[PDB]
Amino acid sequence: QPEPDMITIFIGTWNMGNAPPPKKITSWFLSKGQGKTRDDSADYIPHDIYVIGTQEDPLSEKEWLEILKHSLQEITSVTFKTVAIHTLWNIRIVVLAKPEHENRISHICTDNVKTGIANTLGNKGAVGVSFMFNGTSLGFVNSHLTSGSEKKLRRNQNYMNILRFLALGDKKLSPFNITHRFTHLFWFGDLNYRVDLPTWEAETIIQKIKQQQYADLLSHDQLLTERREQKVFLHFEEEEITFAPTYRFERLTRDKYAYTKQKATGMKYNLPSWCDRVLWKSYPLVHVVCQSYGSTSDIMTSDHSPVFATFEAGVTSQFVSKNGPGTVDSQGQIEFLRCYATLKTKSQTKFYLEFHSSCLESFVKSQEGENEEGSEGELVVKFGETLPKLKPIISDPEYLLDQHILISIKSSDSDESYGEGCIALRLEATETQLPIYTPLTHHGELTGHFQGEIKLQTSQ
Ligand SMILES: NC(=O)C1CCN(C(=O)Nc2ccccc2)CC1
Numbered sequence: 001q002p003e004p005d006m007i008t009i010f011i012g013t014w015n016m017g018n019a020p021p022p023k024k025i026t027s028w029f030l031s032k033g034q035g036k037t038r039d040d041s042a043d044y045i046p047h048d049i050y051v052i053g054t055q056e057d058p059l060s061e062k063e064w065l066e067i068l069k070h071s072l073q074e075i076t077s078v079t080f081k082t083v084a085i086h087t088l089w090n091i092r093i094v095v096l097a098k099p100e101h102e103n104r105i106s107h108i109c110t111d112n113v114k115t116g117i118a119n120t121l122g123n124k125g126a127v128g129v130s131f132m133f134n135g136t137s138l139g140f141v142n143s144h145l146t147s148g149s150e151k152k153l154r155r156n157q158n159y160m161n162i163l164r165f166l167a168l169g170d171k172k173l174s175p176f177n178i179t180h181r182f183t184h185l186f187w188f189g190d191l192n193y194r195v196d197l198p199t200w201e202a203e204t205i206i207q208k209i210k211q212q213q214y215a216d217l218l219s220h221d222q223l224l225t226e227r228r229e230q231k232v233f234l235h236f237e238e239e240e241i242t243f244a245p246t247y248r249f250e251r252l253t254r255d256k257y258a259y260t261k262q263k264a265t266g267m268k269y270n271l272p273s274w275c276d277r278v279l280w281k282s283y284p285l286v287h288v289v290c291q292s293y294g295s296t297s298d299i300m301t302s303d304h305s306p307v308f309a310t311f312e313a314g315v316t317s318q319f320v321s322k323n324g325p326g327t328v329d330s331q332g333q334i335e336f337l338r339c340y341a342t343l344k345t346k347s348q349t350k351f352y353l354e355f356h357s358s359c360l361e362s363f364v365k366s367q368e369g370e371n372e373e374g375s376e377g378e379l380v381v382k383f384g385e386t387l388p389k390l391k392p393i394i395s396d397p398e399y400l401l402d403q404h405i406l407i408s409i410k411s412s413d414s415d416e417s418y419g420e421g422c423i424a425l426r427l428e429a430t431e432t433q434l435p436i437y438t439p440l441t442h443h444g445e446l447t448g449h450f451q452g453e454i455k456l457q458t459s460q
Contacts, residue, residue: 002106003317005035006287007048010025011309013142013188015055017251017302018090021067026075031308035243036186036308046076047310049083049097051129052143055190056302057092061085068094086130091189093127093142098159107132113165115158117147122156123140127188129203130168130182135316135358135402139168142191145441148268152222155192156232172363173356175417178446179235183404184282184288184313187236191306193223194273195245197257202259206271209244209257217245219276234444236279239293239309245272246295246305254297254305262423278309283404284424284438287314316402324393328361331459334396334405334425336387339452341369341409341440343379343418350412351381357410359392359403359425368412380410381451397458401426405440419447423454432456 012028029039029050052068059067061303072080081102083095089345091209097105107130112123126143143162146154169181178185195204197220208217218224218241248270250256261267276295283289292310299306323329341351353366366388369381394399403425410418419440425433433453440448 001262003212004048004315007133007246007313007315009051009186009313010047010050011140011186011188011191011311012051012306013276013278014248014306015144015190015276015302017252017304018056018058019301020058020148021300024299025067025306026071027162027298028306028308029071029075031292031294031310033243033294033296033298033305035241036239036290036292037294038292042076044076045076046072047131048101049100049138050080051140051186052094052096053188054146055142057087057090059307061087061092064092064094068096070094072109079276083131084108084110086110086112086127086129088114088125088127089123091125091127091142091144093129093140094374095129095140103135105131109168111167111384113162115161116313120146123281126166128166128168128178133315134318136314137169137182139185140409141166141176141178141185141189143187145190145192147192149196149271151196152193152226155222157234160443160445167300169393173311173406174352175410176356176406176420177444179281179441180406180420180422183283183286186278187280188278188309190275191223191277192275193221193226193277194275195271196220196222196225197271199269199271202269202271206257209272212246212402214243215239217272220395221279223274230446231280234441234446235439236281238279239290241274241293243293243295245274246276247273248303249300251303252300254300254318258303274387276304276307278307280311282313283422288310291452293398313364319394319396319399321394321396323395327338328391328393329395329459331457332400333394333457334384334390334392335455337385337453337455339383339387339450341381341383341419341448341450342374343381343409343440343448345379345418345447348409349414350416353383353387353410353417354408354410355390356406356408359400361393364390395457395459397430397460400456400458409440409450417442419450422448425456427454427456430456430460446454
């Protein structure tokens with residue numbers, strides 16, 4: 001039975017509106033409704049992994065597990081294994097996997113972050129799950145961010161708090177937040193970003209939706225505009241939206257957007273919006289293709305419609321050689337040449353690098369680089385040809401070219417990271433000096449750049 005090189009992952013996000021679901025929700029797991037939908041011919045084909053994110057979920061974990069498992073079994077005739085379930089307040093994440101994956105899945109982590117302070121702490125935040133699938137790390141975040149058209153700044157702050165404080169993945173990757181810890185990261189939920197148009201335009205917006213004309217609406221989507229100005233979700237992908245806004249509906253139909261201010265809304269308008277979203281971020285040159293992204297038309301218990309997205313995702317085997325794991329493979333080495341970091345920092349400390357990778361027995365600290373003044377004010381840290389030679393555990397190119405090196409640049413004075421990034425070893429050539437490049441981030445904001453040349457030696 002061969003180990004896979006590809007899996008399909010289903011991501012669902014639904015704000016249930018504190019209402020139990022209808023008896024049939026199979027349309028969700030089949031990616032049927034509006035947008036980029038799944039072909040009929042695939043309906044009996046199970047996804048390898050189903051990650052279900054809910055918000056305003058009124059069910060017990062047991063009640064929702066019963067509905068989810070029975071739903072998938074009806075569709076696929078497969079009895080899915082529960083990998084993880086985590087619930088913060090009414091925010092919930094469920095990971096289900098095909099039974100043949102049970103002994104491929106290990107190192108399962110769960111965590112939550114509560115966002116806000118005093119007034120604003122009590123119901124918003126994120127739940128998450130991470131695990132290894134053979135040699136591939138996977139993380140999943142379900143976030144319910146701050147509501148309200150006039151709170152996109154709050155939403156961006158909620159995002160930065162979740163990505164700083166959600167403790168998933170390999171704790172040995174201590175310089176690195178969840179946006180660097182996984183081969184594939186999926187971040188979904190009721191992100192709560194709104195179509196920023198005047199309240200007087202509501203009926204015009206509704207008109208535009210009935211005509212399936214979304215272009216002039218998406219140009220005002222706060223998530224799309226905030227991402228374009230690099231305020232939020234830096235270096236995440238989102239598939240093109242081709243489905244009507246998923247909020248706010250009158251319940252028990254989809255024929256009406258309920259946007260007018262009411263006591264129940266705190267006297268706030270809820271203009272039709274894409275509150276309900278799936279974004280991802282994969283390590284450089286790993287296969288990840290979105291195969292669906294849409295909303296259901298036929299689940300109407302909530303003022304939100306469910307959103308599905310499906311993904312082909314590249315996975316690797318748990319590699320064993322004669323040598324590593326348990327030693328180095330002297331036939332392998334990773335060399336950095338002519339490397340410099342550019343940092344936006346005003347500080348004057350010395351910097352050193354840390355190289356972290358599952359292809360190394362443990363992380364490698366460099367010597368300090370040489371600080372220069374850049375033309376336009378910047379700090380440029382020069383490493384030149386000083387950087388330590390990295391000793392992979394396995395030299396087999398079938399392993400090593402599928403790996404990645406995480407880079408942190410750290411203050412000698414404080415040992416704090418000023419920047420994190422990632423280099424793919426999926427090079428055009430081995431035993432050849434080749435350009436490498438990663439942006440550097442800290443708390444998921446741009447702090448600089450790292451570039452140079454790599455020279456990779458493999459057993460071939
Ligand atoms: N949060 C909990 O109560 C857990 C959830 C289920 N579980 C597992 O071990 N699930 C599992 C592990 C590896 C591969 C496939 C499935 C034990 C208890």
